[PDB]
Design a protein around this ligand. Structure first.
Ligand SMILES: C[S@@+](CC[C@H](N)C(=O)[O-])C[C@H]1O[C@@H](n2cnc3c(N)ncnc32)[C@H](O)[C@@H]1O
Ligand SMILES: [Ca+2]
Length: 228
């Protein structure tokens, strides 16, 4: 029964994705409904109760991919359609093409801000969005990896986009690169929330310690803070 609904969503997301690329003018309504489904206790129970390892795992992986691209493409359109304290320095891994949140933090806090994104399109647009929304804020947007960033030791706060598949592989890499007092915020979704997020992982106990795990029954992602 739960299998069916997920198959319907997977088909719809691919259709809405295939479709929105052809014409920017639906998908955003589907995602809102998708959340209501993920956050439903009824379907949280059925999701856990269903233990067909093979067909379940495959369905999560597929929805994880298409929803990640859908969200990624929403920000691309929104961009072209439009077009922590002061001494701290925030690093948002997965800044996106429409970095509105990144802007919000820059204004309220006044901190330095580095955004990285592997998509050259997201970086290219993001920069343009920042130059209109906050040109007089210390906001650097680049396609550099964490290892490439020169002033990586100055970074105090790190946030990860939930929809980054190998976010924990990056977190692993950051230990040696970053200073001793750095704090990391890892967005994730476990259980039924893993169909619109990538899940948490166990960290090397000698490296990263999880000092907080903020679960929210009414929100689409949960948060896990990490220290050294
Ligand atoms: C949907 S967007 C913006 C963040 C979104 N508001 C969220 O909270 O998930 C996520 C971005 O992460 C980027 N991304 C994916 N894998 C990445 C990686 N390994 N390093 C950096 N950015 C990555 C994608 O290009 C995508 O534009
Ligand atoms: Ca400070």
């Amino acid at each position: 029964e739960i299998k069916l609904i997920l198959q319907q969503y997977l088909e719809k997301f691919e259709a809405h994705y295939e479709r929105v690329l052809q014409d920017d003018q639906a998908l955003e309504t589907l995602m809102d409904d998708y959340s209501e489904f993920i956050l439903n206790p009824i379907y949280e129970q059925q999701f856990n109760a269903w233990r067909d390892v093979e067909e379940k795992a495959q369905l999560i992986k597929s929805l994880q991919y298409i929803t990640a691209q859908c969200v990624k493409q929403v920000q691309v359109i929104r961009a072209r359609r439009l077009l922590i304290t002061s001494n701290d320095k925030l690093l948002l891994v997965g800044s996106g093409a429409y970095p509105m949140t990144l802007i919000q933090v820059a204004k309220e806090t006044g901190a330095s801000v580095i955004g990285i994104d592997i998509d050259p399109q997201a970086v290219d647009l993001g920069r343009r969005i920042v130059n209109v929304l906050a040109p007089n804020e210390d906001i650097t947007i680049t396609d550099q990896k964490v290892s490439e960033l020169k002033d990586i030791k100055d970074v105090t706060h790190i946030i990860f986009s939930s929809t980054i598949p190998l976010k924990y592989s990056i977190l692993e890499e950051l230990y040696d690169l970053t200073n001793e007092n750095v704090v990391v915020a890892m967005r994730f979704g476990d259980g039924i929330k893993a169909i619109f997020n990538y899940p948490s992982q166990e960290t090397a106990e000698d490296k990263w310690q999880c000092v907080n795990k903020h679960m929210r029954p009414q929100q689409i992602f949960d948060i896990a803070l990490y220290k050294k």
